[PDB]
Symmetry: C3
């Protein structure tokens, strides 16, 4: 298997970023033909999702997250830190995605993209990558 990573500099507290490009980069630096790619982040207050990188939708995702997780809301973790909402967002969005690579083609749908979801920015974040296959 092959293994790699790249950084993602986020600019806002909540922000969705399309990192598909960097993933494919690494992936071609590996030249995998048939196998699985695992995209994952080692952060508990950031997540990764797969969906459409349409600007307005990306705004909606942040607002959707803000609504459900309540940044600054009545969370007991507030006694300890101020990012409770980010941890909560991470738990129902997820921190890793498995993506098949078939015949050299990263198996994403026509409108699917790899989105880094920052919930405690601005920070210099990391995305780790693992390729398992031929």
């Amino acid at each position: 298997m092959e293994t790699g990573s790249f950084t993602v500099k986020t600019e806002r507290r909540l922000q969705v970023l399309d990192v598909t490009g960097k993933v494919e980069e690494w992936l071609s630096t590996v030249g995998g033909v048939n196998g699985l790619l695992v995209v994952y982040v080692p952060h508990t207050t950031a997540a990764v999702a797969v969906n459409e990188a349409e600007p307005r939708l990306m705004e909606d995702i942040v607002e959707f997250i803000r609504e459900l997780t309540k940044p600054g809301g009545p969370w007991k973790h507030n006694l300890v830190d101020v990012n409770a909402h980010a941890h909560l967002g991470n738990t129902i969005i997820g921190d890793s995605r498995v993506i098949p690579v078939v015949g050299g083609r990263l198996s994403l749908g026509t409108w699917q993209r790899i989105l880094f979801v920052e919930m405690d920015g601005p920070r210099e974040r990391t995305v780790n990558l693992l390729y398992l296959g031929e």
Copy 2:
């Protein structure tokens, strides 16, 4: 590895369908004994989950989704299209699931089933399948 897919015709805007049968089908057409199966959909407005295929629960799942994602709600993606809620549902449900295959047995729990979650139907949808192992 082996690779396959099947279509799923959805009938309603929001609908949960049990597609366990078709997955096992393909899986036996492959005869995998020990390995991993990846069930994933290339759609950004549909998802896949694993849970109980009880009729009333399946209704509840749609209502749960409707409540959190607000179809037709105040989403900026509305300027572009009318399925913002579906994209949102997809992000916290997920578009792929990894399921171990051990000793020829698809490793699902007694009450676990593979559910296709349509949020922008009626459409002719696709489920892709990947088997990696011996």
Copy 3:
């Protein structure tokens, strides 16, 4: 591949438990160096997530879940059983996680931990484990 499991005795209806220790245990009983570990639960009313095992945060996670899934709320599954909320929580948290093992190191972030999320306790639950690699 290697395969294993361990039980998790939950004490409350909703409860988050850090089971990282037991996973690493098994993992060393296997001595994997490079590969993937799949942590998954065969339950439809329990889930697994990866995040920080801070006590107050863990309380917040349960309250967050309680808020979104409404235990005892107006769910049609209520005609059949009383755990509708748990099924709902399971669908947007997930029942399996893939974790890379690189150079003998379980690839979790500094503050990431494997959390069992019980939503229909108290019960004697199971976590299944699969290691695929060298």
